[PDB]
């Protein structure tokens, strides 16, 4: 009925605000990106610092893992993405084409494509093997805040400050669905549900919404947290109870019951906006990370 997440570790090392944290698909690692231009890798279970990956010329807004846990991609203010060999820390490829900050990135499940979103209002799709841009989508009329592939990589969902969430056919680059709200708040984050049937979209009016995008139907609204300013990550937690997990501008991590929408836990400890949270693929572990007053990542563990 309610989880009992407790703080296990606080991970310090970044020298500016942290921007995103992501667990490796194999569950061994956490990767973090920062405005400090660095990616850092941490042990998921003991919180032990592992290595720093460097090479971007400006801050990084996002990082994402390949399905084999062997590669990372990062999205930077320097207008590029970089693909990294996790093992060696070496930059394999630099993906060039965006004309403004790259804000968000993700690999497909097959890990042969990367999708990116940028302040240049486009979504791009890249070949992992060659580093070539395969498609540029004129996706939105304002910065693209999030991009995510579904369970088999056949669709991309994008979100933007323009107030829209769009679903795209990966192979053709065609927009299959636009979700709209008559009051048109900026959409600050989106991702598919693990089963691929739903999208979870954050808007800058302190709400998260679960949509059946095929039917154009909003099914659940999660409220009570603070989110009017930043592009904060949200998550489905499915290892124990079925929850929704998000950061918040009141410095807390919020956890809701997915079905009932009840807040079941708030995690206190950070001293700035919790910009990013991530859920461990197999264990009931959450990672959270915070902005400039804080600069730390925390690891939390629950029995359910």
């Amino acid at each position: 009925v309610k989880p009992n997440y407790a703080l296990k570790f606080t991970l310090a090392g970044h020298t500016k605000a942290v921007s995103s944290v992501k667990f490796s698909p194999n569950g061994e690692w956490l990767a973090s990106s920062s405005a400090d231009k660095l990616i850092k890798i941490w042990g998921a279970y003991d919180g032990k610092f592992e290595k720093t990956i460097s090479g971007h010329k400006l801050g990084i807004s996002d990082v994402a893992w390949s399905s084999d846990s062997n590669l990372l991609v990062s999205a930077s203010d320097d207008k590029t993405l970089k693909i990294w060999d996790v093992s060696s820390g070496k930059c394999l490829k630099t993906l060039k084409g965006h004309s403004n900050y790259v804000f968000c990135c993700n690999f497909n499940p097959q890990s042969n494509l990367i999708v990116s979103g940028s302040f240049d209002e486009s979504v791009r799709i890249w070949d992992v093997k060659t580093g070539k841009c395969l498609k540029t989508l004129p996706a939105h009329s304002d910065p693209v805040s999030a991009v995510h592939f579904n369970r088999d990589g056949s669709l991309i969902v994008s979100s933007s400050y323009d107030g829209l969430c769009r679903i795209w056919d990966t192979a053709s680059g065609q927009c299959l669905k636009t979700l709209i709200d008559d009051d048109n708040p900026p959409v600050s984050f989106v991702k598919f549900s693990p089963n691929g049937k739903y999208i979870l979209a954050a808007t800058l009016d302190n709400t998260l919404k679960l949509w059946d995008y095929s039917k154009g139907k909003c099914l659940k609204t999660y409220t009570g947290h603070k989110n009017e300013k930043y592009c904060i990550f949200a998550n489905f937690s499915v290892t124990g109870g079925k929850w929704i997990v998000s950061g918040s501008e009141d410095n807390l991590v919020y956890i809701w019951n997915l079905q009932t929408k009840e807040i079941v836990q708030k995690l206190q400890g950070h001293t700035d906006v919790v910009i990013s949270t991530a859920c461990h693929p197999t264990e009931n572990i959450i990672a959270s990370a915070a902005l400039e007053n804080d600069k730390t990542i925390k690891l939390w563990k629950s029995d359910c």
């Binding site: 500016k16 605000a17 942290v18 921007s19 995103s20 920062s34 405005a35 801050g59 807004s61 996002d62 203010d77 900050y101 804000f103 302040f119 910065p143 400050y161 900026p186 600050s188 800058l204 300013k229 930043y230 592009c231 910009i275 902005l291 400039e292």
Partner: peptide
């Protein structure tokens, strides 16, 4: 960009 307010 993510760590500042741009909206």
């Amino acid at each position: 960009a993510r760590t500042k307010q741009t909206a």
